[model samples]
Target chain A: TFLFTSESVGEGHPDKICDQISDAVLDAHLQQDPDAKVACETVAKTGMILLAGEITSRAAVDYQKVVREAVKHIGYDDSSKGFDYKTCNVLVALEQQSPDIAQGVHLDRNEEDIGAGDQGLMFGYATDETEECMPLTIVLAHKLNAKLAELRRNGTLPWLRPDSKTQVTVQYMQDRGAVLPIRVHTIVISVQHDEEVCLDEMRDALKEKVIKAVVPAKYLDEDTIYHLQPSGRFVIGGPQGDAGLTGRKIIVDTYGGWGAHGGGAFSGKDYTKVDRSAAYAARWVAKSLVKGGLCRRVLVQVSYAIGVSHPLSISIFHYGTSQKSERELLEIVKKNFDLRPGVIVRDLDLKKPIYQRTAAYGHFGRDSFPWEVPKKLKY
Target chain B: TFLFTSESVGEGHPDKICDQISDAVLDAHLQQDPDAKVACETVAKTGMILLAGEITSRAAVDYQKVVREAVKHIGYDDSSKGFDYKTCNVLVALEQQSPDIAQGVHLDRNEEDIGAGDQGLMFGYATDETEECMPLTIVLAHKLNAKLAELRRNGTLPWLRPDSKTQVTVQYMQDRGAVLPIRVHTIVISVQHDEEVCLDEMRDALKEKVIKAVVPAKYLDEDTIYHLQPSGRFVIGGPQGDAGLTGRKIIVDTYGGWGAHGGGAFSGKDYTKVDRSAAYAARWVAKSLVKGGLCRRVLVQVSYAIGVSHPLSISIFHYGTSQKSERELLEIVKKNFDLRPGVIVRDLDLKKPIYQRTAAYGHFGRDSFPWEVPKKLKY
Candidate 1:
């Protein structure tokens, strides 16, 4: 059996809250001026929210107000419960983008020749195991975490808190003549709750209202095991309980542990940064290839260099499940996809305030995002 | 043919600097109190260094002094540079570990029955491509970056600065009966240099002293492409040019996109946390398996749950390179390895102050660390 595992954290998790604030700032700037260059970073602790990064934008926005609004949006409204949105100290250390670095991404062009912001590798993956073209393990974990947030918001699970993490392990039968996910093996989830809520009561509610509501019934069996709040009393959570920084939960933000990562974070970056735009473009291409039945699985990799409009390399792998030969598959991929940083920004329409929507759950697999939308493949 | 890529940043890169500062704190704590529980996080930008996280120990170390020393050790001591260790403002927001979270990890007994710090997936990988049993791309990239630092310290290139990055892409011949790296395709290096030294001088120095001196002769050829300082100028780098936080460079810390990551950060965490301890254990086991000639390449995966002694899952994949059957290999692995978090900590002797040494460069492939030492595998 081929067993794989993945994890996801709630938007209220400390690190995720930082991500939301960074993206909120990016979104606010993009809404005002699409051509803005932003690279925002955030840190959250017990009683303070620090915003520090370089932003070259024509749009003038109150970053402290943005931080408070983002925290408020994440439901950190009650001062009595660990952290509060309205009262936390907000420190801003933002400055203009360094001219030395800015000249590269803007070396000589507008929409076609803009170079990558930095040099790094990025990977995008898709699998036929789920209809969304995403891996099944991460999909379930994210769904469970999202459901917890939903239950708390709707008053169904009144004692629930926003900070939660979900891990799902799946068993894939990969013997002869078989290549599919068979069953769920183990699940681990941790959640923060109100002081009055008893441990067993909150766990039972999670099983009934969160786990069962999100995971498919067919995946569950007698052999499946659950470990709820292995970290028992999670009353003190969020920023008050832990220190967090933006770009810390990257693997969770992408394909979980299913595929490779370029080591670049997504939140708080503008479209000009290949680390953000090219990653989405790679995901879009992979999903399109899978949806068009070109392969049962695909991993799209692209590498870029700062001030270089063209990528240093482009590679694709189909995990031996594709009908086309490797050479032919790569040729087909290159024929249909243009992965330059500027081209990706143009093709994906990334010059907008659409980042905060993807600041939570996972960036991919959510069809609501533009990158999640599949296109007709060139057959 | 299969093409792979990996990258490495010098110790003075903003993110790497934060990692060093965090690990320095952890090392100092572990040196004083072996059983200390530390989860320190650092954020460095411009003239500020913010330290925030939880620590439970009998040690009383100066956090600001530790930060300055860490920066000084990284060769960022000059006030004329963009960043200076002695002049930056160091803010401390550390506190005791949350009681709610501490209760879970200590729910049961000590030694064998201790639980994991949190729940997440982690993967360790090894390949027989190089003598060090690491992927060639990352090995070369790290060697280049480290050599740049070496040259600067030794006065070989007096104009060299500390901040730098290196990326290498290698072409692997995977067709027919060949399964080996064939040649290097591209190399990218960025370094911060003095203003007196022209870009061409810095680029030429890197090509000769850094690249030629470190990279093997066979890997270099006529078609090998080089992109140095694609941003044109990098005098303003390090924490001054960018906002960096601990754990932001996870991929660069581990396999550099050669394998999967569990979304956990290693630096600033104590040994009890599975994220740091278990990851090293996984790497140790994977390297031993490959070194014992069990496989040419292998990836080891393990998942843990907070307050649970045993791991939820253990998986090993040999990339179809093993002579032994998958079932037999798995059986051998389970028979020889004890993957429980406590057992791993005991086996690796992880309760020490060795983490700071690994904060820079790739964590694996370096024989200096305890986990990098191969064991005598049970045949």
Candidate 2:
């Protein structure tokens, strides 16, 4: 059996906290200035928050207030919970985009002359392993974390805290020459809780309410292993448990190690940054291709050069699973997709304050996001 | 023809600057206390630096001094350069690691029982395409950035600033049905420079001094495309040009998009964090497999659970290039490698101040690091 594992973190995990704050700031700026160029980053610890990065916009924001509100919204309002939003120090270090680099991207408002805000590669992927076209391991992992959060917020688990992590391991086998036979091999969950809760009670409640409620029964075999709070206890959590920095959870935010990442983070960046927008576009293309029945699985890669209006290269991989020729698919993609930064922004309607929800969960699998919308391809 | 592209950024690039500062602080802690549990993160922007993370060590550090020194060492000492190390604000948000989490890892100092610092997946890749067993596109890209940094430091190119990026796209063909044939197709470099230097002069000098000096002649053809300083002007560079956070340049720091990343960044994290140390161990395993003449190319993936001593899974992908059976290789790996958190630290000698040097360039291809050392095994 070949085993594949993927992990996910809840919204209050240290890194996720930073991601939420950064995207919250980005949304605040975009709500006022659609033309804003923001690259905000956040660093959070026990009793302090630091906001740093460049922002060129007409929006006036109290960064300290925004950060405090974001922290409060994440349920970190009590000092007994390890951190208090009201007491934590918030510092701002915002600056304008460097004029020299700005010249290339803003030389003209014309779409043809608009250059990519930065240079980088981005990837989008899809698979038939899950209903959402995401890897089954990652999809299941995300569901478990989401369920944990749901239980905590709804008061079903009063002792539960915001910080938690879930991992799912699936075993794939070629049974009787089957193409891909898969089943769950193991599930690992680590949830932060109050010291008042005993380990036995925590494990029992989690297995019943979180795991049994979220994971499908068909995947779990008789020998499936379950590790609930494997570390035995997790009382101290969130930013106070460790340090939190924006963009640190890129893998958890995307494919969960099932697909390749180009290493560009999505949170806190405006649509002008190709690192954010082009990645969304690539995902749109990959999902559309799969939804259109072009391939069983696909990985689309696109790269850009700084201050260039067009992509340097576009490549696709189907893992020898596609019936069609790669050249034909490439041609179709080039004709059907408008990958320019400005075009991506316009096509996806990205200049909106809708990113706060994306800060915690996976970015591509959910149906609410614009990129997750399937498109019709003439080919 | 198929085109594959990869990129690299210089030390002065904003993201890389944060990487360096984070590692510098990590190295400082290690130099004084080898048993330090550090998770240092840094964020940089115009006129300011923020350091935040968790630490548990016997050593005392001057965070402000370390940040200033790292920036100054990257040649951002003068205010005329848009960012001056001496004048920049330095904020610290450090806290002790949460005791509840630490209890799991330190519950037993015994090598057999010490758990991982965090839960994550890490990948290590190797290919015979280059002498260093690295992807050619990323190797060439890194060489160009290294040369640019060399020129800046050696005064060979006085007008060149520190921030820069290099990208290489290679065209590959299946000649006579040959497997995995590759050759360079294009090279793009964007270097931050002084306004005093003209574009024509800068391009010509770079083509001759940097490109020609590093890239092999066999890879370049008359049709090869060269784009130098494509953005036209880059006088305002470094942290002044963009916001940078630690771990943002993970793809550049590793396989440069040639291999799949587990999305665990290497810098600023101590050995106990599986994200940093396990990745190094994975690379060691890949390089050893290639050196043992078992495969021409190999990708090794290992996953761990937080507060667990053993990995959840170990996977090997040879991409149809291996002479050995996958089952046999898996057996061999299981018997040979010890992937436990404490064992990796002991085997790799990870608790040292050697991490600062790995914060820039690429982390895997360099032969000097311990993880790059080849191992012997009886088959």
Candidate 3:
């Protein structure tokens, strides 16, 4: 038997709060000015919220207001709730980006082709095994954590707090060069809760309300190992529990260890930066390739330089599972995808205030955005 | 041509500065108390250096002096430099760990099989292409970046400051089974230089002194595209140009996208956390398997959950290149390896203050690491 694992943290988790704040500030800037050059970072700790980074935008964004609203929106509004968004000291150290660094990307400042914001490699992955086009392990993990958040927000689980984590390990079977997830081998959930709720009661409620509702029946089995709140008590969590920095949970943001990551954080960065734009384009192309039946599984790697509009390299790996030759598939990538930095940003509609929604959970599986929709490949 | 690209930044990079500082703090604690618990994060910007995180240790540490010493040691002592260690403000918010959170980790600290500190997945990779057992593209790129920093510090290229990036895309020719890197397809470098050097002279100097000195002659060719200083000049950089956060450069810390990343950074955390320790163990095993000629290339995935000493799963993907069945490899791992969290810490000597040395460049390719040694597996 084969196995794969993935994990996710709730929005109230320390690192994700920072990501949420960074994206919130980014959205605030982009909402007012789409051409803003923003690369923000957030740091969240007990009684503290600091928004520090570079932003070169014509729009005047109330950075402190965004931080408070973002934190308060995530349900950290009371002193008893690990951190009070209303009372926490909100510090801002944001400044304009240096002209020399900006000089590399906006060499032309015109319409057709601005260079990539920075130089790095980005990867995107997709599989046809699940409706979300993501690996079952990560998809399942995200659902559990998302369900936990929903229960708290929708008043279903009043005793639940904001910080929590969920993990899943799915056993797989390889058949005819294709991989199929056979069963959920293990389930781990560690969530923060009010002191009024007993460990056993909270565990039972989650197993009933959270697990049975989010996970499908086909994947469950008698041997499914449940390790809920394995450390017993978790009354203290969120920013009060640990310090969080923006863009730290990148694995949880993307494919959850199912695919490769090129080490670019998606939050707080504008579309001119290929870390977010090209990454979204690669995800779109990978989904298109797999969803269009060109391959059973797809991994797309796109590279960009400081002043290059077109990708320096685009490589495809089908894992010997596709019918076409590697050369033919490479040709298809060249013929099908317009992988320029600006072209990707335009095609994906990335120049908008839409990142706050993707601040938590995995960014690739949920399908309301442009990258979620697959393209019609040139077959 | 099948092209794969990997990138690396100098140790003087903004994010690297933060990582170096955090590791410095962690090392300071570990040097005093080997069993210290440290999860430090650093934020650096113009005129400010903030260190915030949780630490529970028997030994006391001077966090401010650590910050200043780390900054000064990294060549940020003078105001004329990108950042000054003496003039910049040093703020520390370090605190003891939340008892509730520490309860999750140190349930039984004086044991041989302590539980994993967190739940996550990690991946490790190895190949026989280079003596480093890392992929060619990333290895070559690391050398170039390291050489750039070396030139600056050794007074050979004193005009060079701290912040810079280097990227290399290698064209590969797929043989009957193995992938052989054939030529350097493209090379891109963006280095911060002194105002005295002209563009042409700097370009020629780098191409002659930095490039030809590091890269192999076989990989260089006539078609190797050079895109140097696409921004024209980079006189201003470091924390002034952008904000810095620890663990932001996860890809550069590992196999540079040649292998998968679990998104768990290696700089700030301790060994009890499975993210860093299991990653090192997996890499050790992967390298052992490749060096022993058991496989040509390997990608090993390991998973862990809180309160569990053993891994939830260990999956091996040989890319259909191994002689033995995967089941045999799995059995070999179980019979030969002791992957208990405490056992791994003891065997790797991870309780030492050796993290600062591995903070920059790719951690896997450098042969000085304990993880760099290949284990002699049971045949």
Candidate 4:
């Protein structure tokens, strides 16, 4: 039997906080200058937001104001919780972008764009296990944690705090010719709560309100088990309980181990950073491949050189599940996908300020973002 | 044929700077109070280091003093480089550990008192690829940048700057067979240097001094191609060039995408944080599997809960290449290895002030620290 596992973190977690702030910055910049060249990184803690990186634009952004807006949006408004948006220190280390690097991507016309911002391989993956084309384990885990956030903000579960985590383990069955119909073996969720709430009650509430509401009932057979806050208490959480940094959540931001990652993080940066944009383009390519009936599963990798317009190499793998020859499928991909860096931003409508929404949940498989939405380009 | 790739960053990278600071704090705490419970995180940028997280220790340390020492050691002593340890802002957000969490791990010394400090799974992997038992792409990449740093610091390559990157792509044979003896398909190295040195001269110097001295001649076939500073110029680098936060180098911290990661980072965290300690324990187990000749390729995963004494689950995958049954090998592993969080720290001698040295280069497979050295123990 093949085994798969996926994990998720709540808004209050340190890394998640950074992700939120970074994306919030992305959203803020996009609102002002859609064509701005921005690459921001955030590191947040008990009472501070440290902003660093490059920005090439005419607009002047109040970084501290943007940070506060982001943190408040993430539900970190209470000082007693060890962090408050209004009172935290905000330090900016960002500078103007390099002219040499900008020359390659900021072409006169969109079509003449030379290449991606930097050179590195990026991969995109999709599965039919969920409605969003994401893997079941990651989708369910994200739902549970997202539900926690929803319950907290709406007061559906008043005791819940901003920080939390969830993990799902699936046991694949070989009853079919190949591994399929995996049984959901276990679900683990730990949610931060107010001190007034007892640990046992918190556990029960999560089991009923979050886990039960999100996970598919069919997958949870008699052998399935749930461990809700096994440690009994989590009164301390958020930046106070742990340190947070941007781009630390690479696995969570993508397909959650369902597909290989080129090790790029999306939050806090603009389309100029290929780490974010190329990954989005790769996703577009992979989804189009699956839609074109090329393969049941596909992974496409493209590498680039910094300040260079064209990528050094492009590779496609169909896992032997493609109906057509791999060579044929790869040729089709090359013909259709515009893997150029600048073209990715324009074609995907990546200039919008929709990043904060993507900070916590998986960046892929979301119909909310333009990049996540598949383009119906004629094949 | 299957395709796998991984990447690593140098110390000058922004994320790596935070990692270095965190590990430096961890090392300082260990040096002062070996039994200290510390989970440190650092966020660094143009001119500041924000240290935050939880600590329960008897030792008294000047957090700011230690931070500056760490930054200075990282070659960020001058403000001209955009960061100066002497004048940079230092913010501390450290606090006491949670009482509920500490209660479980603070059991009497005689009771085999070992439980995971947190709930999560960790994986460790090794291959007979290189002398360090690390993946080739990551190892060679790390070496190239490391040699570049050595030359820069020693004044042999005066043009070299603190910030740099190196990537090596090795072509492998089709199928899950042996590694091909093909020349490097591509080598991308971008080194920050003085403007006086032309790109061609710098490129040639790098090939002669750094690349040739490190990568073995056998690995470079006639087709070996070099792409030096593909970005054309990189006068700006380090935190000034880009912002850095801790624990963002997850891929570089481990097996470089060769094996699955539990999504945990090692630097800046203490043994009490299972994110770091449990990973070390798993590595010990995998190395043992290789050392005992039970498997040529091994990947072991262990999970735990916060305040729990024992791991929640343990699984080993030998890829059907094991000399013994996977179950039999796991039984031996459970009997011999101390998977408990507390016991793991003791077993690996991880309570040393040697973490800063590991902030750069890949965390695993390097025998520079006690944790990298394996020990033999009978059940």
Candidate 5:
């Protein structure tokens, strides 16, 4: 039997704080100037948040307002409980975009207007294991976490807090030609909550309200063990409980350990960074392959260098589990996809303020983003 | 034939600065209190560095002073050059460790303290492609960047600046399991220097000095193409030119796209974080297997949940390229290895300030660290 595992976090966790802030900055820049070059990074910890990056555009952003709004949106408005939007220190160190790098961006003619701002490899993966083409374990884990956050934010579960995590493990049978699910092995969720509740009561409530809300009815057999805050209590969390940095959730940001990652992170950046654009492009490629019945699962990798117009390498793997010829599939991908960094941004309409929503959720499987748009020029 | 790619950066780069700061915080805590729990994160840009994290410790630390010292050590002491160690804004937002996490860490009163601090999956890989079991492309890439930094610091190449990157692409013969000496597809370096040096002169000097000194003499053939500073000029560099976040270099930090990654990042986190510890444990497992001649190439994945003592799932993949039974090899791994979070720290001797050095260089395949030391324990 083979096993698959994936994990997810709630909105107010430390790592998610960085993701939210980074995306918020991206949103702010994309809102004022869609063509703005923004590469923002955020670090958050008890009572303070720091925003740093380079930007080049005519648009002026109210830095403090953006930071405060993001924090308050995540339920960190009170000062006495540790971290607060109004009381936390905010440090901004944004600088004008470097002339040297900007020259590369502005140098080329009309059709060749895209040059990569940095060089790195990116991978996108898709599998037919879940309705969204995401791995089942992560899908279930995220659904649980999303429900936990929903209840906490809506006051349906008054003892729950914003920062939380959920994990699920699935045992699978490798069918001769396909993979089949066998059983749910484990489910673990640790939620930050009000200390006023007893451990037993909190555990019982989470089992009945949070965990049961999202897990599919068929998967909850006696073999599926739920470890709800195995630690006696979990009253403290947020940045006060851990340090959070943008790009730290590379795995959580993508396939949750099912598909390979080229190790590029997707928050706080416009698609100019090859790390973001190329990754989105690769995911689009994988999605197309699966949709076309080329493969049951696929992973694509593309690498680039800063100021370079093209990727250094592009690779597609079908793991010998595809219905289509690997060579023919590669050929189709090469012909149908534009792996160039700048072209990806334009092709996907990436110059928007919609990135903040992607901070907590996995980036690839979501149906709403431009990156997930199905290929209309299918061969 | 097969193609692989990898990249590395010098210590002076903005992202490297953030990496260094995160590790520096780790060092500060480890020095005074070996039992100190820290999850440091940093964001650097322009003239500011923000340090944030939660720490549980018995000793006090001057967080700002520690940050300044780390920056000074990185050669960013001149404010006139954009970022300065003495004048840059330093914001520290450390908080007490979450008690909820401590409950798991202190559970059972066991001798080895086997609790996992957080939930996540990690992977480790090994291939006999190079002397150190690292992929040839990444090994050479790191050497190129490292040598560039060395020459620049020594004034042997006075024009070289702190922000630069190097990439290497190698062609591998699938049948022979050896990389063919066809070409070094590309070598890209962007060094910041005084305004006086023209792009041509800088490029020429780099080719004669940095590239020659770094690439082994035997590997340099006429087929090697150099793309040194392809954009011609790069005077403004480092954090002033880009946003930098800790743990953004997971690919550069590990196998450089030569092997599968479970999507865990290592920089800016303490040993307690499974993202770091579990990855290290996976490395140890894969390294041991490679050394034991169990597999020519190996990848191991393990997933965990916060406060749990054991991984939810553990898997090994040798791509049908293993010399021994994969099942037997996994049995060996399970019997000899302790994959729990706390035990991984003890097994790897991870409670030290040695993290700063790991921030810039690739974390795996380096023969320097204790984690890299292969152990042959018999059950």
Candidate 6:
């Protein structure tokens, strides 16, 4: 037997808070000017938030107000929580995009020769292990964290706070010559709470109300281990507990370590930045391949050069889960997909200010995102 | 044919500057108190640098001085470079480690259950493609950037600036039933330079001095594509050109997207944090396996729980290159290595102030780091 584990954090998580603020700022810019160039980043610690990055846009924004609103929306407005949105310091250090970079990306009035904003590699992965086409461990981890947030927001868990983390481990067993089957081996959930909540009560409530409701019954066996708040207590959490910076959670943002990551962050970047756009496109390709029954699992990778209009390379891996060869799949993908930065922006309709909703949880599993929609392929 | 691409950035790159500053601060703290708990994060843009994170140490440090010294050490001291180390605003927002986390990690008198500082997954990778046991593409990418930095520092390339990036794409071919062999497919390098240097001269100098000298001659062929300073010019570089954060380059710091990443960044974190220490241990394991002739390529993954001494899972992937089964390897590894967080700190002697040098270049491949040292395995 082999075990695989993945973890997810709540919206109020230190890193997630920075991600939300960064995306909110990006959305603000994109709302005013879809063609704006933004690569904003945020760092947050006790009672202070700093926004820094290059942004070239026609939109006028109050950086402090945007940051405060994002923090307030995440339930950090109370001073009792150790971080008050209204009183916290907000520092901004934004500048115009470098003219040198603009020289390569800017196009003529005819809108030709649109190039990528930067050079990087991006990956997308999909698996049939879960209904969301994501890894089972990550999907379960997200579910538990989402459920904790739901309980807190709905007042079911009155003492619960916004910051939380959940992890799930699954044991995969291969019956002699049979396909590998997995069972839930362990689940760990840690959530910030008020002092009034007792340890035993917190554990019982989480198992009954959160864990049991979200995890599949078939996967949970008698041997499964449950670790509720393994750290014992979590009264202090969020940005007050840990300093957070945008892009720190790239693995959780993508495949929960189940797939490879190119190390590009998604939030605060415009469509021209292939780091965000190409990753979304790769997911669309992987999902389409799986939905088309081309493979049970797949990983798609694409790389680009700064100021280059075309991808430097495109490759796919089926991990021995496909009936066809990787070369054959590559040919089909190249013929069917247009991976140019501008083409991806157009094909995916990525100019809209819809990134704020994707700043938390996982970016690819939900059905609401345009990239999550499966497509029909003529292979 | 299959194409694989990887990219690396020089010390002057915005993100890399942030990484270096963060680690410098961390090293300062650890130099005074080996048990110091630090999780520092840094962000830089324009004329400002911000330091935010948790620190529980008796070490007295001037945050501004550390930040300036790191930037100056990276060759960004001149005001003409657009990021003057002495004049840039340095804002500090460090706070003590949250009591909730400290409560879990801190022990009274006894050090038996020294639980991990945090919960996350970390990955380590090794390949026999190079003598360093790292992927060829990433090794070449680092070599190009390192060569550029060396030439600039030594006055060989007087017009070059500190900020630079290099990407290498390799095409792997399988001849009938033979193993995959790779060749250079494309090379892209973008470096910041003085305005007095023309683009043609910069391109020619880089090609002649940096690229040709660093890359293997056998890999270069007639079909190789070279893109130098693809953006035409990079006079406005470093933090002035882009915003940078501490952990944004996790992939480059690790395997350069050649292997899976757990998303945990290494720089600025204390050894107690499994994100940094366990990743180092995982690399030690992978490197030892490769050096022992057990595998040509290997990927090792380990997961941890906060306040828990033992690892949640340990898995290895050979990618069809190993003669032994993964289960057998796992047994051998578990018997030989002590993966506990406290054990890793002791085994690697990681509490020293040796992180400043690792923050810039790739962290895993170089022989200078203790984790890169190969071992003799009994099985």
Q: What would the DockQ be for model 5?
A: 0.60
TM, every model: 0.98, 0.96, 0.98, 0.91, 0.93, 0.97
Candidate 6 local distance difference test against the native: 0.86
Over A51-127, each residue of candidate 3 has an lDDT whose tens digit, in order, gives: 88889999988877888999888899898878997889999898888888777778557744888888899998988
Give per-residue CA lDDT, model 2, range B1-379, as digits (tens).
7787899998889889989999999999998999898888888888778887788899888888888899988888887777888999997878887777788786556865688887778888888776788888888888898999899999999998888899998887533212253567778999888879999999998899999999888888898888788888888888888888889889988887866788777888888889988899888888888888888887888888878888988888776667787677777778888999788898899997988899888888895688888778567
Q: CAPRI verdict on model 6?
A: high
Docking class of 2: medium
Residues B90-132 of candidate 3: C-alpha lDDT, one tens digit per residue: 9988888778767776754665678887788889898878877
Model 1 residue B220 lDDT score: 90
| Pairs of residues at least 3 apart in sequence or in different chains that clash in candidate 1 | none
Residue runs of model 6 more than 4 Å from their true location after superposition: A109-112, A173-181, B109-112, B174-181
Q: What is the number of residue pairs that collide in model 3? A: 0
* Over 4 Å off, model 4: A80-82, A86-91, A98-115, A174-181, A318-320, A323-329, A368-379, B1-5, B79-82, B104-114, B175-181, B318-332, B368-379
The TM-score of candidate 4 is 0.91
- Total colliding residue pairs, candidate 6: 0
Instruction: Give per-residue lDDT, candidate 2, residue B123.
Output: 89
Estimate, for each residue in B255-281, the C-alpha lDDT of model 5 and write its tens digit.
887566666567767777788888888
Q: Rank the candidates by DockQ, best first.
A: 6, 1, 3, 2, 5, 4
lDDT of 4 at A51: 76
Score chain B of candidate 3 by TM-score.
Answer: 0.97
Worst 10 residues of 6 chain B by lDDT: B173-182
Of candidate 3 chain B, the 10-residue stretch with the lowest lDDT total is: B104-113
Error of 3 at A154 (Å): 2.3
Off by over 4 Å in 1: A175-179, B175-179
Model 3 DockQ vs. reference:
0.81
Model 3 lDDT at residue A11:
87
Model 1, B291-353: lDDT tens per residue?
Answer: 888888888889998888788988887878887866677788788888777788778888878
